[PDB]
Amino acid sequence: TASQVDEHFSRALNYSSSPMSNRNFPPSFWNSN
Amino acid sequence: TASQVDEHFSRALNYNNKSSPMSNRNFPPSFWNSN
Amino acid sequence: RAIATHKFRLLEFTAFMEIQRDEIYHRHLFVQLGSFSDPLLETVDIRQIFDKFPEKSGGLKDLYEKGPQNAFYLVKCWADLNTDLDFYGVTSQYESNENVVLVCSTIVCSFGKQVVEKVESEYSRLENNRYVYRIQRSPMCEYMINFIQKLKNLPERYMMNSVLENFTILQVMRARETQETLLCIAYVFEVAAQNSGTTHHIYRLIKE
Amino acid sequence: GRAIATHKFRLLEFTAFMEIQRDEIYHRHLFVQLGGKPSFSDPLLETVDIRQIFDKFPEKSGGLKDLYEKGPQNAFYLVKCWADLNTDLGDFYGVTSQYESNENVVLVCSTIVCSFGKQVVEKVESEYSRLENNRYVYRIQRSPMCEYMINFIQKLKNLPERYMMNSVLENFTILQVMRARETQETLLCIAYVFEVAAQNSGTTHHIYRLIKE
Numbered sequence A: 001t002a003s004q005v006d007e008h009f010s011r012a013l014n015y016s017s018s019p020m021s022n023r024n025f026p027p028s029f030w031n032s033n
Numbered sequence B: 001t002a003s004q005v006d007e008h009f010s011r012a013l014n015y016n017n018k019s020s021p022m023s024n025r026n027f028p029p030s031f032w033n034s035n
Numbered sequence C: 001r002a003i004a005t006h007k008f009r010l011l012e013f014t015a016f017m018e019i020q021r022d023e024i025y026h027r028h029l030f031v032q033l034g035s036f037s038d039p040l041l042e043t044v045d046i047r048q049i050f051d052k053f054p055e056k057s058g059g060l061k062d063l064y065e066k067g068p069q070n071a072f073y074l075v076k077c078w079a080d081l082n083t084d085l086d087f088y089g090v091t092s093q094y095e096s097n098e099n100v101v102l103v104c105s106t107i108v109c110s111f112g113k114q115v116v117e118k119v120e121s122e123y124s125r126l127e128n129n130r131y132v133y134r135i136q137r138s139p140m141c142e143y144m145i146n147f148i149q150k151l152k153n154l155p156e157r158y159m160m161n162s163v164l165e166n167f168t169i170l171q172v173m174r175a176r177e178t179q180e181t182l183l184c185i186a187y188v189f190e191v192a193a194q195n196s197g198t199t200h201h202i203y204r205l206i207k208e
Numbered sequence D: 001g002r003a004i005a006t007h008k009f010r011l012l013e014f015t016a017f018m019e020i021q022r023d024e025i026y027h028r029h030l031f032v033q034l035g036g037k038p039s040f041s042d043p044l045l046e047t048v049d050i051r052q053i054f055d056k057f058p059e060k061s062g063g064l065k066d067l068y069e070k071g072p073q074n075a076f077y078l079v080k081c082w083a084d085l086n087t088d089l090g091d092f093y094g095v096t097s098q099y100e101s102n103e104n105v106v107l108v109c110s111t112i113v114c115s116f117g118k119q120v121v122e123k124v125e126s127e128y129s130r131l132e133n134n135r136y137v138y139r140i141q142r143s144p145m146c147e148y149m150i151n152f153i154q155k156l157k158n159l160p161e162r163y164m165m166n167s168v169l170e171n172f173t174i175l176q177v178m179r180a181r182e183t184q185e186t187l188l189c190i191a192y193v194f195e196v197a198a199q200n201s202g203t204t205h206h207i208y209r210l211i212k213e
């Protein structure tokens, strides 16, 4: 529902889960090109 | 997630003492007796 | 359990858990629904349950008004929670006298608000002069697994029924091309007694 | 290992799009696009440790760890997408999927939309094959995106900064699980993670094999 989209944006924008940048991914993961 | 299930349980149980109940609505007697 | 209209019927709806102990499978049925001869069903005024389901556009009241009104049902379930809590799932079977494409929407509601939704599409197979739709072993969402484990671990049995007071499931079966409502089942729940299996009652919903 | 495929099942297409009519002229904006054309011009796939993405997908029974451990492990892929959101906003939001199978299965395609690792909506389609050039091909063409997705995309474009769009997409994932109805085996499983493409670029992606080293 619309309310669930809004719930997601509130939690995500509220700046217990490591950021993706702090996890082990190869350098291609951060390069769109 | 566990937190979303927890929110429903917390609101329903109301441990800290923070709409008609189903028991008082218009249902046939069979609604309350499994048999 | 014959939940049937002039054209569509639910033949089976089984919510269950499966465990493999010592290389042998064991299944426990939480809920089980499902003859061409039955007595008349008891009726229930749909207005008594509106507040337990979403009331916006496309909600239970809007769906009932659009009809057909012979497709609305209320199922009262006594869920069997007596088991040692691996797969959690639902197996269901449906029958039609017309080969439409089935679209089954199931929503889980907490205090009349949608928490999670599942939309499943199935094609029929003609079998013994009826079209059959099967949805075998559809995996339960994490919310429901979490909900069931938390419910059975409540320290007092009355609490299980208090938590179920505002927990509902709404199923809307539709024919894909026409968007016709084939069946709509509203579900409400209580926990079965310790020494008992799952039981249920079925009610036709009417605007009383 | 060069494509989202096993020895007996492959992804032929996955396209997320929106159709826009303006001044009696139709155009289709591609948010995400994965092809499946198989040739020597395809680089070998990099690998990603699946233990790094478990909290972004459903857990417990039937979740990603359970499906991966049940296997086959070579059916598991992670796609990192740069969704193209460089579009103004009557519009149709759709998805087109296409698959190829060595065996004539009844393909059960489950798609789970997740927010912070929790399912919001699951769409399941049980498709039958069509014989196209002696191949079993399955197509779910221009299937409507659910209202949740439409609202999500519309709300992402309201963000004044791209860093806010990326923080919001960090916890938005999609999990695709393709199964054969008769055996209930996993034929293919694709996890999707997202970032927003640069304003001067269209959609790009990288495909990774999920390993548990």
Ligand SMILES: CCCCCCCCCCCCCC(=O)O
Pocket (backbone or CB within 6 Å): C015, C030, C031, C079, C090, C106, C108, C118, C138, C139, C140, C141, C142, C144, C147, C148, C151, C169, C189
């Ligand atoms: C909470 C105890 C009573 C209800 C237990 C059985 C409910 C029926 C199955 C619900 C499945 C919803 C859809 C899904 O999770 O995929």
